[PDB]
DNA sequence: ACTGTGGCCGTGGTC
DNA sequence: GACCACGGCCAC
């Protein structure tokens, strides 16, 4: 199985390693016959011989073109003659390809900015984590010494805990009294043991959370303080700290460092991402959390540091445990994508696509477009019509069923052949023509995407099945991660044609993909209401809910499946209507905003106050309780009296701090807010304070009682003292509860004064 | 920071 | 007050 690829540099020349695990063993396969190349397009070919002349000094040493080859390639379909330049080293690449381009016989230059070691895996065909090779996985944490504002690192590392299938074990150097704790002398010890145990242990995988930012980081800075070599690497490395835009990211040479938190942070939707809500949403069970005032008031004093040590323990149990689960995963969308895990685990769902797209094209020989240049970006500015949303029917309705095209945007793209090197091929036999926007697809040949996008949708459906037959429930909700997973990168192709800085961009394709889309769902709505006496009661984009007026449950169920029977017939290629659920009750509320409860009693709720991460706890637990009275009970006076109740308990300050508190996601440097509202007022008094603020950081603060901007009463979550301050009730009633549950019953005629305490 | 557009809603800046 | 950009996050 191959893990990873890399080259190094002997003698000036490249050197390619294959890190690979084979029968058990590990591997290292060098290969020093890869020749880095690009392309250049000519006005024409005589002009070579005075382009390969071109030269650049780097570092003193001139780089010289070193051989010339000209090449038959495709470029969007059609034929086109190139030059293949090589060079005698990866960095020769940079150093000249400006100066080759600047040449002025010289049109275009092509896969110029593509990384040496990723060239290799692709030009060679070569896919990682393919296998039933079994690799080996080792987490581990640490605990810090840390008070309020000093530097990082300043502090000692006071435990690192580590965990795989068989053991979890708290290495430190004071002592405590419990079995899976090794006391060692000193820090410098506890960490040399640590380095012992990866070694001894080598593992495969190292699992982290947040380990690309925090944990490697602070060993690093450690291991300089006290005069010790961070040995992790199979090759005798010490770990690679490479720059990912605002964050880092850490390598390990030979091993796959498998971070958790990128993985969970795009799979999971949750108001913060401890490692304590993370195990609790993927496992259902709680894990405590001991503070960091906690861990240093027991080191100091040498008192209750057993409770510290299991949560250190703990802490590398639950991320080994949430490493186990995700890899597989992680593993499917390596093979998919064909780069490493270390990669694809890290990477932005566009480059995903892009990385996809590479391989396949040089399977294919179509040459690569280029990333567009400050101008292409700026003329790829204009944005495009997207799905058409049904502003919904009010009120409460009975017998909903709901259905829904499978992978539609994908479906249109491969029935239609939409693909920018289909759009407006001149003399075709056969057209497929947009509606409202008029492009034209050629169905003569396959599109390049068109053609590679089956067989995700056929890896999707392959997931589905073994889900919906998996019993145990953990699993299955890994199995829907990672059918979603699918999903949302088959549809990223569609929204990658609208992407501004995506290679084989093609904005015809990305508004003749939503032309079609809009036209579909409107014939359904039609035929649904004109020919088969159905209600729509709401729409979005390629789904909708309908009743029959009037009708029991069994009659819309029968109805539905006989319209399904009557519409698929009709449906051209991959497109499919589904029935996807059918709710008893149900209510809409607005565009992107409704709840309805099937028949096992399941409330399922879309885009209301209850669903999002950005508000209180007590307004989206109340909401949550009037939607069951009304849902489950039909009960209506019961949800006001809930709200009542409530408001009753703010107005008291009965209700605890932890239902206050607002969760936000800073999302850009502090500096370029045009205007900052509560989570930046906070954010800004912090960073003020000396605490790092980056894109990510999720701000928690609770409103005090006050008058004026928000932001002038906001406090960090943490600095809530109920006894110094107090909550501020109304802003919580009035701003919060109220608005989130009079959404929901102003449709039975109560306003907000029905809701309030006396 | 980087797959797309449609959309709701709170906050606070301008008159 | 009206007006309405900005920002966050959600449904597709
Ligand atoms: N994350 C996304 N990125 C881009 N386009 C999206 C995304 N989510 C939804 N869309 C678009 C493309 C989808 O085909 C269309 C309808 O959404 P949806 O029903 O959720 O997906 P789908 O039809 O691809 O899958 P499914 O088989 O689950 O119904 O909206
Ligand atoms: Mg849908
Ligand atoms: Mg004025
Ligand atoms: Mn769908």
Partial sequence: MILDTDYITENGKPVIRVFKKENGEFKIEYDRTFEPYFYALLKDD????????????????????????????????????????????????????????????????????????????????????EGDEELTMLAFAIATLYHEG???????????????????????????????????????????????????????????????????????????????????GRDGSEPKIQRMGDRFA???????????????????????????????????????????????????????????????????????????????????????????????????????????????????????????????????????????????????????????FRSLYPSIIITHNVSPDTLNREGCKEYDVAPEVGHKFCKDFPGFIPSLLGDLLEERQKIKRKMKATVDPLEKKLLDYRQRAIKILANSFYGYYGYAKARWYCKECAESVTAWGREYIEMVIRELEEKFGFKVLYADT??????????????????????????????????????????????????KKYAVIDEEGKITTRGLEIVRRDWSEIAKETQARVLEAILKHGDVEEAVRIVKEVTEKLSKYEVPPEKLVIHEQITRDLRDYKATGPHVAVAKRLAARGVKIRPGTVISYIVLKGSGRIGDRAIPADEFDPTKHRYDAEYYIENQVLPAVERILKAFGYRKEDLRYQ
Wanted: with cysteine.
């Fill in 46 to 129: 005589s002009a070579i011989e005075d382009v390969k002349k071109v030269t650049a000094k780097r570092h003193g040493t001139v780089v010289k073109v070193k051989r010339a080859e000209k090449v038959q390639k495709k470029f969007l379909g059609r034929p086109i003659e190139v030059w293949k330049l090589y060079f005698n080293h990866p960095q020769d690449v940079p150093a000249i390809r400006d100066r080759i381009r600047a040449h002025p016989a010289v049109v275009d230059i092509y896969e110029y900015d593509i990384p040496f070691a990723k060239r290799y895996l692709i030009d060679k065909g070569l896919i990682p984590m």
């Fill in 542 to 591: 390629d789904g909708l809910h309908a009743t029959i007026p009037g009708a029991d449950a069994e009659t819309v169920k029968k109805k539905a499946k006989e319209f399904l029977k009557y519409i698929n017939p009709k449906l051209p290629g991959l497109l499919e209507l589904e029935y996807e659920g059918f709710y008893v009750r149900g209510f809409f509320v607005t565009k």
């Fill in 250 to 404: 850490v390598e390990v040479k030979g091993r796959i460092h498998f971070d958790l938190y990128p993985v969970i942070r795009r799979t999971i939707n949750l108001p913060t991402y401890t490692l304590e809500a993370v195990y609790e949403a993927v496992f259902g069970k709680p894990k405590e959390k001991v503070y960091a005032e906690e861990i240093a008031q027991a080191w100091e004093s040498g008192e209750g540091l057993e409770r510290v040590a299991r949560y250190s323990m703990e802490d590398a149990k639950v991320t080994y445990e949430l490493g186990r689960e995700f890899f597989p995963m992680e593993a499917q969308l390596s093979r998919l994508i064909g780069q490493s895990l270390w990669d694809v685990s890290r990477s932005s769902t566009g480059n995903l696509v892009e990385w996809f797209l590479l391989r396949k094209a040089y399977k294919r020989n179509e040459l690569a477009p280029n990333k567009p240049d400050e101008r292409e970006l700026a003329r790829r500015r204009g944005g495009y019509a997207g799905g058409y949303v049904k502003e919904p029917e009010r009120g409460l309705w009975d017998n909903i069923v709901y259905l829904d």
């Fill in 150 to 232: 000093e530097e990082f690192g300043t502090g000692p590392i006071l435990m690192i805990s580590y965990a795989d299938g068989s053991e979890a074990r708290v290495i430190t150097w004071k002592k405590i009294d419990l079995p899976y704790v090794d006391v060692v002398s000193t820090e410098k010890e506890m960490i040399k043991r640590f380095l012992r145990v990866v070694r001894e242990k080598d593992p495969d995988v190292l699992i982290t959370y947040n380990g690309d930012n925090f944990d490697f980081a602070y060993l690093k800075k450690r291991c300089e303080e006290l005069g010790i070599k961070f040995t992790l």
